[PDB]
Amino acid sequence: KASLDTQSTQVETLKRNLIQLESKISEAKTKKEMLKARITTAKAQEQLQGM
Amino acid sequence: EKMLEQAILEMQEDLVQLRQGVAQAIAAQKRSEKQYNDAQNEINKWQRNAQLALQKGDENLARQALERKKTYTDTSAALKASLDTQSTQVETLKRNLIQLESKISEAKTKKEMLKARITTAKAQEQLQGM
Q: Which of A4, A6, A11, A17 to mutate: most B Cβ within 10 Å?
């Protein structure tokens, strides 16, 4: 019983981690789009300086 | 797991030897008992022979048969001394087996608890990789 009450905490603790990572991976994919926007702009300014 | 499985298999095989040692200890008790019982029988046999010698008029042989009784009585005492001292081990070794029986069950229960905290430790490491 002692172990049962102590081992149950992990289940809920590990469940919270999965819930938090589910929304963090979606934000990582959204960062890509934003990263490409500033990467294309940075290159655009470099192309403007070559004239 | 690797450090529990190996311990669980080695802690269970050691109990077999303990039980075998108790069997030998039990055998010893019975072995000495018979020897002590034979000594008593020997003494009794001598008594009859000594008494038979007295009835026939051979006191000389009867006196020599009394020495055997004393000799066997002294041997009995020696055997008795060991018997009383060797019995302690039987009960002492029996207590060890009784205690180890519940300790091996707790060792198996620790595995489950160990895996719970091991999965949690790895879970936190996976959360830090994001």
A: A17
Phi, psi of A50 (to 5 degrees): -85, -10
CA distances from B55 to B64, B70, B83, B98 (A): 15, 21, 37, 58
The tokens describing B124, both together, are 């936190």
Reported residue count of chain B is 130
Contact at 8 Å (CB) between B68 and B46? yes
Closest-CA distance, A20 to chain B, in angstroms, reads 9
CB B72 within 8 A of CB B43: yes
**C-beta separation of B127 from A20 below 8 A:** yes
Shortest alpha-carbon distance between residue A36 and chain B (Å): 20
**How far is CA B12 from its chain centroid?**
19
B116·A20 Cβ contact <8 A: no
Q: In this structure, what token pair is assigned to residue B120?
A: 């949690």
Tokens coding B117: 């905290």
CA pair distance B12, B20, nearest whole angstrom: 13
Contact criterion met (CB below 8 Å) for B40 and B76:
yes
Residues 6+ apart with CB under 8 A from B25: B86, B89, B90, B93
Structure tokens at B37: 């019982």
- Asked how this structure was determined, the answer is cryo-EM
